[PDB]
Design an enzyme around this catalytic site. Structure first.
Site, PDB file in Angstrom:
ATOM      1  N   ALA A  12       0.830  -1.198   0.000  1.00  0.00           N
ATOM      2  CA  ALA A  12       0.000   0.000   0.000  1.00  0.00           C
ATOM      3  C   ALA A  12       0.867   1.252   0.000  1.00  0.00           C
ATOM      4  CB  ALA A  12      -0.939   0.001   1.194  1.00  0.00           C
ATOM      5  N   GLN A  15       2.865   1.621  -3.533  1.00  0.00           N
ATOM      6  CA  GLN A  15       2.027   1.956  -4.682  1.00  0.00           C
ATOM      7  C   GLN A  15       1.401   3.341  -4.551  1.00  0.00           C
ATOM      8  OE1 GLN A  15      -0.687  -1.392  -4.996  1.00  0.00           O
ATOM      9  NE2 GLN A  15       0.767  -2.528  -6.275  1.00  0.00           N
ATOM     10  N   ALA A  99       5.612 -10.480   5.226  1.00  0.00           N
ATOM     11  CA  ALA A  99       5.179 -10.678   6.603  1.00  0.00           C
ATOM     12  C   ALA A  99       3.910 -11.520   6.688  1.00  0.00           C
ATOM     13  CB  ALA A  99       4.967  -9.334   7.284  1.00  0.00           C
ATOM     14  N   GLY A 143      -1.692  -4.758   6.592  1.00  0.00           N
ATOM     15  CA  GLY A 143      -0.596  -5.598   6.143  1.00  0.00           C
ATOM     16  C   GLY A 143       0.403  -5.858   7.251  1.00  0.00           C
ATOM     17  N   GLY A 146       3.243  -3.209   6.497  1.00  0.00           N
ATOM     18  CA  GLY A 146       2.717  -1.873   6.711  1.00  0.00           C
ATOM     19  C   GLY A 146       2.385  -1.570   8.159  1.00  0.00           C
ATOM     20  N   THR A 179      -8.162  -8.289   1.775  1.00  0.00           N
ATOM     21  CA  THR A 179      -8.086  -9.715   1.493  1.00  0.00           C
ATOM     22  C   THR A 179      -7.502 -10.466   2.685  1.00  0.00           C
ATOM     23  OG1 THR A 179      -5.975  -9.337   0.354  1.00  0.00           O
ATOM     24  CG2 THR A 179      -7.958  -9.495  -1.007  1.00  0.00           C
ATOM     25  N   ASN A 206     -10.217   3.047   3.278  1.00  0.00           N
ATOM     26  CA  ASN A 206     -10.355   2.488   1.937  1.00  0.00           C
ATOM     27  C   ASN A 206     -11.806   2.427   1.474  1.00  0.00           C
ATOM     28  OD1 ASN A 206      -7.895   2.105   0.726  1.00  0.00           O
ATOM     29  ND2 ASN A 206      -7.637  -0.016   1.418  1.00  0.00           N
ATOM     30  N   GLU A 254       2.179  24.999  10.680  1.00  0.00           N
ATOM     31  CA  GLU A 254       1.326  26.023  11.264  1.00  0.00           C
ATOM     32  C   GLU A 254      -0.100  25.498  11.439  1.00  0.00           C
ATOM     33  OE1 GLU A 254       2.385  30.018  10.104  1.00  0.00           O
ATOM     34  OE2 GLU A 254       0.264  30.582  10.040  1.00  0.00           O
TER      35      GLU A 254
HETATM   36  N1  LIG Z   1      -5.587   2.446  -0.734  1.00  0.00           N
HETATM   37  C1  LIG Z   1      -4.812   1.397  -0.992  1.00  0.00           C
HETATM   38  N2  LIG Z   1      -4.781   0.336  -0.110  1.00  0.00           N
HETATM   39  C2  LIG Z   1      -3.992  -0.736  -0.366  1.00  0.00           C
HETATM   40  C3  LIG Z   1      -3.211  -0.783  -1.511  1.00  0.00           C
HETATM   41  N3  LIG Z   1      -2.538  -1.954  -1.506  1.00  0.00           N
HETATM   42  C4  LIG Z   1      -2.871  -2.645  -0.392  1.00  0.00           C
HETATM   43  N4  LIG Z   1      -3.776  -1.904   0.318  1.00  0.00           N
HETATM   44  C5  LIG Z   1      -4.395  -2.268   1.603  1.00  0.00           C
HETATM   45  O1  LIG Z   1      -3.402  -2.782   2.467  1.00  0.00           O
HETATM   46  C6  LIG Z   1      -3.927  -3.832   3.254  1.00  0.00           C
HETATM   47  C7  LIG Z   1      -2.993  -5.032   3.173  1.00  0.00           C
HETATM   48  O2  LIG Z   1      -1.667  -4.616   3.421  1.00  0.00           O
HETATM   49  P1  LIG Z   1      -0.551  -4.572   2.262  1.00  0.00           P
HETATM   50  O3  LIG Z   1       0.083  -3.203   2.224  1.00  0.00           O
HETATM   51  O4  LIG Z   1      -1.144  -4.910   0.916  1.00  0.00           O
HETATM   52  O5  LIG Z   1       0.504  -5.715   2.699  1.00  0.00           O
HETATM   53  P2  LIG Z   1       2.027  -5.406   3.135  1.00  0.00           P
HETATM   54  O6  LIG Z   1       2.159  -4.033   3.747  1.00  0.00           O
HETATM   55  O7  LIG Z   1       2.962  -5.553   1.958  1.00  0.00           O
HETATM   56  O8  LIG Z   1       2.330  -6.494   4.283  1.00  0.00           O
HETATM   57  P3  LIG Z   1       2.638  -8.035   3.926  1.00  0.00           P
HETATM   58  O9  LIG Z   1       2.161  -8.353   2.529  1.00  0.00           O
HETATM   59  O10 LIG Z   1       1.916  -8.917   4.918  1.00  0.00           O
HETATM   60  O11 LIG Z   1       4.126  -8.272   4.031  1.00  0.00           O
HETATM   61  C8  LIG Z   1      -5.309  -4.156   2.718  1.00  0.00           C
HETATM   62  O12 LIG Z   1      -6.276  -3.668   3.619  1.00  0.00           O
HETATM   63  C9  LIG Z   1      -5.402  -3.389   1.420  1.00  0.00           C
HETATM   64  O13 LIG Z   1      -6.700  -2.882   1.227  1.00  0.00           O
HETATM   65  C10 LIG Z   1      -3.237   0.282  -2.404  1.00  0.00           C
HETATM   66  O14 LIG Z   1      -2.549   0.253  -3.425  1.00  0.00           O
HETATM   67  N5  LIG Z   1      -4.042   1.372  -2.138  1.00  0.00           N
END
Ligand SMILES: Nc1nc2c(ncn2[C@@H]2O[C@H](COP(=O)(O)OP(=O)(O)OP(=O)(O)O)[C@@H](O)[C@H]2O)c(=O)[nH]1
Ligand SMILES: Nc1nc2c(ncn2[C@@H]2O[C@H](COP(=O)(O)OP(=O)(O)O)[C@@H](O)[C@H]2O)c(=O)[nH]1
Ligand SMILES: Cc1cc2nc(/C=C/c3cccnc3)sc2cc1C
Ligand SMILES: [Ca+2]
Ligand SMILES: [Mg+2]
Ligand SMILES: [Mg+2]
Lengths: 440, 421, 67
Positions: A12, A15, A99, A143, A146, A179, A206, A254
């Site tokens: 997330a 991207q 992770a 994630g 994340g 997911t 989201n 500010e």
């Molecule tokens: N807005 C937005 N949410 C995202 C995106 N990609 C993943 N997410 C959200 O991130 C969450 C899952 O975490 P991820 O960031 O995909 O996974 P990660 O941070 O790589 O962690 P791991 O895969 O377990 O190592 C889900 O709730 C997704 O909806 C994105 O491109 N845009």
């Protein structure tokens, strides 16, 4: 001077970083190869965009950014994408095994194996700064990377940089695009851990973004690309004051002064307007008044909650484009006599206004229309606690049966960490109730 | 980068293993000679998951063929896609198992287990980042049940931080080879509960009922049953082999599907046996399950649904929400959003669109209750125990296996009766 | 007033330093506690598998004492 280093963590975070840095390049006229023909000062400079972009001798404008993910597939796309020449290889860091949506793996098992390298790469950026202002951390709540790795990073950053400002752009989990089933766990865990290490965090639901894309852009099934391009616009609005110089420009720090009344109360509610398609924006110009009105429509918020059922502690309006104070003041005056804007009794009711003359830009092939003017409202409302409430309830449903907890215990965590994290959330929700109560 | 090591043991394990590689090679555009002659680059993007790239641009299946007799394995080498397998990965014995779990796990199978492990290490060390292992076998035989569960235990020692999954075939009197199958099954389950992360319950009784009642086959053969197994295995591995909106390996899949370590026995489903609402409704139909259990006799802990083919993503989301609302009672409330959906653009061979179902239901206790009922009916009279006590076992070990599986049933019932308040 | 000015700025330094100290210690505690727990988790897992070996050897031995 006043450089800001961005750190994008996990899928997330990475991207969303892509969308933002692509959008930045378009706003500043920076080519995908890093060249900027308008920039006359070769080698460096003290311009406003230099807070986000460093400069080389060859005239390449390099993002002050670090991309981190525990698996390579996502960042690999950056390495081979359109803006591959934009980032130095050392700024793009990847592991082999992710992770697996496990906070523990992100914070401990896997995360510890790469954390030193990440800090070193961050140190290389910081050493190029003449007056580093702070960090911008982009990550998801759900994630394992994340959540888990971000919290580890935030903790280490507090040690290596003291109380140097750290801001979050956090992705709040929503069923429509989620997911993973353990995201409420990872969310509560990372929120508890980073809480005292974060100066200000902008949460992005989201589901809120999903709804806006469906309702205002006529998109049947919004993708990550759809969401991120919209998110980038909000991020651009928030960071515009840092990247552009203007007379009516008001620095983000500010705004932050008004936005954070207590250290733990640092989650502003963001609202953006206008979000409109090219078909609907044709032959229909949206004034300062109209876009300002849309800010107080809950359907345009980054987070789903009801400010009408809460109290305001701060209200900031961040305009950009063809906007003059006269029209703003008139629009605000109209709103103050119609909307349900209720302030707590211990803070002023005025609206803090900023204006950046640089008009909004859109990514080619996007859905958003090219508007002459836009506005992002940052408000501190008790209503944002509803987002904590929904998340905490999902947490309690699973933890009462200890569901999925063995995945965390197996990676070295303890049940005490869960209960400790939940109690902190309980206190946080309680904190938001206390600040809303009237004085004696 | 995310490799999976495939292992197949015993007669059943090799035959359903052979059909598996036949179907997925066709989908990835791999000929029996091992060359690629497809048409899409999406067939090779995640090809390294199940295949190795050797000299001459050959794609050799990362598979290990194991048995205690040359019989079944020789049919694989002579059958279609026989020359595609790595010849050194053929590890077979001679003495056989004689449909005895004891000979598989303790005596005969233990004399060959080391030579199998050597092939596992060679395949595992060639991996950039090994996800884990998948095993195809039966629980009602000797080699696949005894040595199959033995291999799991030994791999768990050398690779404890890897995912161990199994496609286990449940014994049924409708397709019964012997009579001692309830023993072998119970002993196998006693091992699977402890040493696996995910287990797909490919119940033979369900396969026979589908072929007979739905597919209208009066005399179902093993070729007919394995056709259902191949289609099912092809479906549950789709998101692993193909580029899509889902970025997850075996571990991330297990995290979303297994709320409690022991309760990791899934109910496979497939449709059809054509609109998205129809495809969805049939996917949740009890007559489309590969396990002889009625999901409306229990509750779903977690559900994984996979749609394949070109269809409306909007409509898929609408129907998956629609089925959860109309059947809320069959989904536990203390696990929010326990149903996840994946979509792949590439459909199976011969179909415009399909759907694969992976359910973690408490109703699977019916499958274990059936085995336990057949088990205790023989154990109470000490029937054929000399086959096992003669190999070194004792009645105590039988009682423990029975007690463990009976506990598993009690555990499924506990969370079925569990409420939010 | 001058010495008050000193006390304020050195109180700011002291609080900032203590925050860094606490964070460093809390993190060191957690990463150490986690390392012990995960190792013990895998230690218990391998010991069970090594118990199956002891049981398997007794099985083959029990059969050997029947021939
Ligand atoms: N807005 C937005 N949410 C995202 C995106 N990609 C993943 N997410 C959200 O991130 C969450 C899952 O975490 P991820 O960031 O995909 O996974 P990660 O941070 O790589 O962690 P791991 O895969 O377990 O190592 C889900 O709730 C997704 O909806 C994105 O491109 N845009
Ligand atoms: N679906 C299916 N089931 C099989 C096949 N071969 C054997 N079985 C089942 O497996 C059980 C016997 O296991 P077996 O194959 O003899 O295991 P082995 O002793 O290790 O070779 C019987 O109950 C059969 O119903 C097959 O090709 N397909
Ligand atoms: C949530 C979810 C989980 C899931 N798990 C799958 C199975 C993978 C597998 C393949 C071979 C061996 N063991 C496991 S497909 C799938 C699709 C979804 C949406
Ligand atoms: Ca310059
Ligand atoms: Mg990831
Ligand atoms: Mg047989």
């Amino acid at each position: 001077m006043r450089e800001c280093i961005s750190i994008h963590v996990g899928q997330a975070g990475v991207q969303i970083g892509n969308a933002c840095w692509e959008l930045y390049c378009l706003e500043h006229g920076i080519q995908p190869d890093g060249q900027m023909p308008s920039d006359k000062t070769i080698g460096g400079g003290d311009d406003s965009f230099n807070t986000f972009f460093s400069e080389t001798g060859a005239g390449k404008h390099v993002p002050r950014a670090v991309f981190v993910d525990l698996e390579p597939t996502v960042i690999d796309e950056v390495r081979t994408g359109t803006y591959r020449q934009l980032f130095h290889p050392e700024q793009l860091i990847t592991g082999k095994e992710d992770a697996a949506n496990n906070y523990a793996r992100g914070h401990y098992t896997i995360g510890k194996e790469i954390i030193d390298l990440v800090l070193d790469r961050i140190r290389k950026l910081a050493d190029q700064c003449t007056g580093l202002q702070g960090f911008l951390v982009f990550h998801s709540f759900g994630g394992g990377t994340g959540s888990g790795f971000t919290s580890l990073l935030m903790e280490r950053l507090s040690v290596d940089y003291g109380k140097k400002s750290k801001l979050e752009f956090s992705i709040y989990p929503a069923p429509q695009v989620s997911t993973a089933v353990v995201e409420p766990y990872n969310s509560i865990l990372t929120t508890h851990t980073t809480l005292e290490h974060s100066d200000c965090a902008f949460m992005v639901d989201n589901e809120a973004i999903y709804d806006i894309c469906r309702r205002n852009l006529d998109i049947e099934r919004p993708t990550y690309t759809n969401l991120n391009r919209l998110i980038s616009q909000i991020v651009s609005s928030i960071t515009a004051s840092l990247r552009f110089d203007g007379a009516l420009n008001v620095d983000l720090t500010e705004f932050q002064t008004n936005l954070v009344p207590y250290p733990r109360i640092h989650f502003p509610l963001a609202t953006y307007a206008p979000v409109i398609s090219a078909e609907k924006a044709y032959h229909e110009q949206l004034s300062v008044a109209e876009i300002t009105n849309a800010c107080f429509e809950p359907a345009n918020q980054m987070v789903k909650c009801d400010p009408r059922h809460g109290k305001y502690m701060a209200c900031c309006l961040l305009y950009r484009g063809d906007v003059v104070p006269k029209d703003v003041n008139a629009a605000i005056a109209t709103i103050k006599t119609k909307r349900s804007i209720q302030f707590v009794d211990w803070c002023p009711t005025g609206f803090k206004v900023g204006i950046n003359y640089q008009p909004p830009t859109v990514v080619p092939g996007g859905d958003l229309a090219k508007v002459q003017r836009a506005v992002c409202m940052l408000s501190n409302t008790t209503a944002i606690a509803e987002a904590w409430a929904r998340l905490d309830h999902k947490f309690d449903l699973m933890y009462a049966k200890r569901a999925f907890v063995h995945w965390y215990v197996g990676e070295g965590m303890e049940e005490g960490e869960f209960s400790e994290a939940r109690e902190d959330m309980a206190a946080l929700e309680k904190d938001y109730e206390e600040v809303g109560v009237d004085s004696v | 980068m995310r490799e999976i090591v495939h292992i197949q043991a015993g007669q059943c394990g090799n035959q359903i293993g052979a059909k598996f590689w036949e179907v997925i090679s066709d989908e990835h555009g791999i000929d029996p000679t091992g060359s690629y002659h497809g048409d899409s680059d999406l067939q090779l993007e995640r090809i390294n998951v199940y295949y190795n790239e050797a000299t001459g641009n050959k794609y050799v299946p990362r598979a290990i063929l194991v048995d205690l007799e040359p019989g079944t394995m020789d049919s694989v080498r002579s059958g279609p896609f026989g020359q595609i397998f790595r010849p050194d990965n053929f590890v077979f014995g001679q003495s056989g198992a004689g449909n005895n779990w004891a000979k598989g796990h303790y005596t005969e199978g233990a004399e060959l287990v080391d030579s199998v492990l050597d092939v596992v290490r060679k395949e595992s060390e060639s991996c950039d980042c090994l996800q884990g292992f998948q095993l195809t076998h039966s629980l009602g035989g000797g080699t696949g049940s005894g040595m199959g569960t033995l291999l799991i235990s030994k791999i768990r020692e050398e690779y404890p931080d890897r995912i161990m999954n199994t496609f286990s075939v449940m014994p049924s009197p409708k397709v019964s080879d012997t009579v001692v199958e309830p023993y072998n099954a119970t002993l196998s389950v006693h091992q699977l509960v402890e040493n696996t992360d995910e287990t797909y319950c490919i119940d033979n009784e369900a396969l026979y009922d589908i072929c007979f009642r739905t597919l209208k086959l009066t005399t179902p053969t093993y070729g007919d049953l394995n056709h259902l197994v191949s289609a099912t295995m092809s479906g549950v591995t789709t998101c692993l082999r193909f580029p899509g909106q889902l970025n997850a390996d075996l571990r991330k899949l297990a995290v979303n599907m297994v709320p409690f370590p022991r309760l990791h026995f899934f109910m496979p489903g497939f449709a059809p046996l054509l609109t998205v609402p129809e495809l969805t409704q049939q996917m949740f139909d009890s007559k489309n399950m590969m396990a002889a259990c009625d999901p409306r006799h229990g509750r779903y802990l977690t559900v994984a649904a996979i749609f394949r083919g070109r269809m409306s993503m909007k409509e898929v989301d609408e129907q998956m929400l629609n089925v959860q609302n109309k059947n809320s009672s069959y989904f536990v409330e203390w696990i929010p959003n326990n149903v996840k959906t994946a979509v792949c653009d590439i459909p199976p061979r011969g179909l415009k669109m399909s759907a694969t179902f992976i359910g973690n239901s408490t109703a699977i206790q019916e499958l274990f209750k059936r085995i336990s009922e057949q088990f205790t009916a023989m154990f109470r009279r000490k029937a054929f125990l000399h086959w096992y006590t003669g190999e070194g076992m004792d009645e105590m070990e039988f009682t423990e296996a029975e007690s463990n599986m009976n506990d598993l049933v009690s555990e499924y019932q506990q969370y079925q009766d569990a409420t939010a308040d | 007033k001058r010495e008050h000015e000193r006390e304020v700025i050195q109180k700011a330094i002291e609080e900032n330093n203590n925050f860094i100290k606490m964070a460093k210690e809390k993190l060191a505690q957690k990463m150490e506690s986690n390392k012990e727990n995960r190792e013990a988790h895998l230690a218990a897992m391998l010991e069970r598998l090594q118990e199956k070996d002891k049981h398997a050897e007794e099985v083959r031995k029990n059969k050997e004492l029947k021939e």
